[PDB]
């Protein structure tokens, strides 16, 4: 039973464009299920950061998929919505200036959050290896304190951060 730790973003995309198939590693390996969204009529989907899972594992989810999974943390979906509403009402009529800020000052965070998904540095690996021969890697995420490091699947990482891997073992001498 999973837990909603944080609501990272909010969008509207193809119906069905939710879950595992929506992670960045799945998307990179198979394309975006929300692919080139738009004529398409959509759904309200939330980008969610999970309890005990790295940001690299976030996934888009609709208030429904959430309930369908019995995830814990639903309370959070209400606050988020109540908060999102509070924001708008307060920014209905703001200077265009107020608006520029909001859009800049929000693109900043938008871009920041993405970093958490990229390995700034691998700092240790496992003595045990998958049947494929991949060890797991303790990864240090871009933008987050070492208290946020974590063990990630060897194969998963290698698909996109083989450098950090290569440069991790290279650093041994």
């Amino acid at each position: 039973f999973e837990t909603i730790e944080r609501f990272m973003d909010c969008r509207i995309g193809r119906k069905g464009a939710t879950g595992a198939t929506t992670t960045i590693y799945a998307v990179e390996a198979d394309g975006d299920p929300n692919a080139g969204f738009e004529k398409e009529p959509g759904e309200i989907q939330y980008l969610i950061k999970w309890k005990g899972w790295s940001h690299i594992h976030n996934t888009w989810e609709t208030e429904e998929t959430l309930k369908q999974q019995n995830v814990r943390g639903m309370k959070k979906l209400d606050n988020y919505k109540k908060k999102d509403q509070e924001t708008k009402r307060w920014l209905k009529n703001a200077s265009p200036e107020d608006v520029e800020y909001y859009n800049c000052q929000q693109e900043l965070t938008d871009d920041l959050h993405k970093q958490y998904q990229i390995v700034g540095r691998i700092i240790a690996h496992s003595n045990q290896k998958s049947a494929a021969g991949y060890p797991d890697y303790y990864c240090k995420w871009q933008g987050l304190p070492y208290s946020e490091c974590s063990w990630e699947d060897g194969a998963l990482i290698s698909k996109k951060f083989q450098a950090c891997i290569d440069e991790y073992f290279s650093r041994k001498k």
Binding site: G19, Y25, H57, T59, D153
Partner: peptide, 5 residues
């Protein structure tokens, strides 16, 4: 290990 499988 552990991804979203």
């Amino acid at each position: 290990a552990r991804t979203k499988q």
